């Protein structure tokens, strides 16, 4: 009778962007389409509402850039690109 599943419905974790497919071309439109198809709506019934919409995607950075890996790794990548040797061997060292 008093089914909790019908009373305690709340958005799941990572809800706003979970369905976003991994792509770089048009992530927001692609994510929007994925949400629409995931929700069970078919394009033939949504009509004109499906053409211009866009939704948040994981491929888009908070700054508004196309990202292909977690931002920490991007930070790690640039950091690792610059690591001069701590101790070097040269004849004139005192």
């Amino acid at each position: 009778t008093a089914s909790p599943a019908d009373t305690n419905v709340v958005p799941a974790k990572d809800a706003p962007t979970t369905n976003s497919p991994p792509s770089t071309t048009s992530p927001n439109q692609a994510a929007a389409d994925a949400n629409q198809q995931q929700a069970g709506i078919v394009s033939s019934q949504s009509g004109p509402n499906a053409v211009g919409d866009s939704a948040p995607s994981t491929s888009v950075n908070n700054d508004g850039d196309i990202i292909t890996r977690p931002t920490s790794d991007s930070i790690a990548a640039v950091a690792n690109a610059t690591k001069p040797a701590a101790v070097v061997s040269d004849p004139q060292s005192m």
Binding site: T25, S26, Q29, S44, G47, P48, V51, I66
Partner: protein, 48 residues
């Protein structure tokens, strides 16, 4: 330095060059993020 006023000139103003007479190597520029939608992406076509 004349090849690199944007990199070393204190007086360098953004948006300047000396193109017809000399080529600089380090400058400022814009970059774009266009998208190329299909026709149906632009407008609701009359399906079927």
């Amino acid at each position: 330095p004349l090849r690199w006023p944007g990199l070393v000139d204190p007086n360098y103003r953004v948006g300047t060059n000396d193109l017809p007479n000399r080529i600089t190597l380090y400058n400022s520029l814009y970059r774009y993020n266009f998208t190329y939608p299909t026709l149906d992406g632009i407008m609701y076509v009359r399906s079927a």
